[PDB]
Design a protein around this ligand. Structure first.
Ligand SMILES: CC(=O)N[C@@H]1[C@@H](O)[C@H](O)[C@@H](CO)O[C@H]1O
Lengths: 213, 217
């Protein structure tokens, strides 16, 4: 059966090169492939076709930092001068008789990007939401790298664990991370405390924001 | 300038038939194979099948008993029908332009243009439009909180699309109710707060909901 084998992840430093690999099953070792890129949150886009003879043809608009090559049953995508936007999932794909097949995808991490401390904004429940007899506190965590944080909520200094939802950090258009945490309360709970706080820990340092009814 | 656009219901019940269309603009569907592909949330790409308007159609061996792909030359459209759906069919569905066949019968393999994708959720739950609340504000953050909608997705733009810089729309959170919520935020200069207005435009196509909300100081 026609199989394209990709390992699930690869890693290299900002500004370095990386060579992603796709291996064809032995009965199809002379096939051409296509490489596709899927940046976080987006649909796929075509990068290039890599031919059996080692030649490759990039899609229109694809940077020349992307190149392709071949060795036996192996098909390669080499990305040079790695930039933050190259963090993406890369899929190889081929053409058989009456069938097309994708590899499992390779997630590329680009290491060593500039460190950035989070900017935290804490929003109280809006008057409109309180008039709808609901209350959400929204803790916005912006512009940080690397992309891992922990969040702790408190009510008048006592920890609050119930009703907390926190998103996995997502890359912003400026290539730094953002994340959000929500604390769900009743209006009566909101109005009963002197204040609520959101504490964000990033790389061993904490940033705290407080709001009051 | 060939572009592909998928469309179809965003919500179907288990055992129903999912029906999608792929409309091609900027070029004809003639001569090419056109493929359907899907991606369950957080998973890889799966080829569903393809069609050439005069040559052949075929589908993935694992889906073939449920897959029917067709074409409509007058509408410049491809279609996918997937019968007897279950939660395993919840996915973003794409079409793509595939191999070109010359009328000599020779060909050049390709897979070079993708559509934008359309999200389909298989569930017996009913559609629900969102409630939108402002997040009121030398930089400041402001935003909109988009609560309690189903299914995904919602789109959020700012100032009717005129504001695209400090904008970030977050991944949705799945509530224990089975509904989704998200927020969208913008970082603006503090000096603009007393003069520039900021209005989020929330679109939820599955419920045909459209809401504008001003985030005012
Ligand atoms: C329409 C179609 O599937 N054409 C395929 C072609 O893409 C593939 O390169 C070749 C492999 O031998 O087999 C043909 O049947």
């Amino acid at each position: 059966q026609l199989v394209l084998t990709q390992s699930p992840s690869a890693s290299a430093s900002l500004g370095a090169s990386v060579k992603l690999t796709c291996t064809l099953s032995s009965g199809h070792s002379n096939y051409a492939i296509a490489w596709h890129q899927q940046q976080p949150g987006k649909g796929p886009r075509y990068l290039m076709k890599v031919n059996r003879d080692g030649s490759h043809i990039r899609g229109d608009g694809i940077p020349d930092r992307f190149s392709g090559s071949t060795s036996g049953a192996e098909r390669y995508l080499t990305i040079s001068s790695l930039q933050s936007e190259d963090e993406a999932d890369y899929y190889c794909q081929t053409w058989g008789a009456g069938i097309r097949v994708f590899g499992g995808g390779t997630k590329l991490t680009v290491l060593g990007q500039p460190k950035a401390a989070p900017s935290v904004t804490l929003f109280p429940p809006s008057s409109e939401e309180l008039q709808a007899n609901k209350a959400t506190l929204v803790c916005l965590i912006s512009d940080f790298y690397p992309g891992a944080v922990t969040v702790a909520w408190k009510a008048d200094g006592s920890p609050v664990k119930a009703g907390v939802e926190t998103t996995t950090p997502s890359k912003q258009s400026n290539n730094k991370y953002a994340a959000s945490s929500y604390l769900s309360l009743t209006p009566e709970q909101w109005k009963s405390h002197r204040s609520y706080s959101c504490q964000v820990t990033h790389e061993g340092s904490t940033v705290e924001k407080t709001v009051a009814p | 300038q060939v572009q592909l656009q998928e469309s179809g219901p965003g919500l179907v019940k288990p055992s129903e038939t999912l029906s999608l269309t792929c409309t091609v603009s900027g070029g004809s569907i003639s001569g090419y194979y056109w493929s359907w592909i899907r991606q369950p949330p957080g998973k890889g790409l799966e080829w569903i099948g393809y069609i050439h308007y005069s040559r052949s159609t075929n589908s993935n061996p694992a889906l073939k008993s449920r897959v029917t792909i067709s074409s409509d030359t007058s509408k410049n459209q491809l279609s996918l029908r997937l019968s007897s759906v279950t939660a395993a069919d919840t996915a973003v569905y794409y079409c793509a332009r595939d191999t070109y066949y010359y009328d000599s019968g020779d060909y050049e393999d390709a897979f070079d243009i993708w559509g934008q994708g359309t999200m389909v959720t298989v569930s017996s739950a009913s559609t629900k439009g969102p409630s939108v609340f402002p997040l009121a504000p030398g930089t400041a953050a402001l935003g909109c909180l988009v609560k309690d909608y189903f299914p995904e997705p919602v789109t959020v733009s700012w100032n009717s699309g005129a504001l695209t810089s400090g904008v970030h729309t977050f991944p949705a959170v799945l509530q224990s109710s089975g509904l989704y919520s998200l927020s969208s935020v913008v970082t603006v200069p503090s000096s603009s707060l007393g003069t520039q207005t900021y209005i989020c435009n929330v679109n939820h196509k599955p419920s045909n909901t459209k809401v504008d909300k001003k985030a005012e100081p």
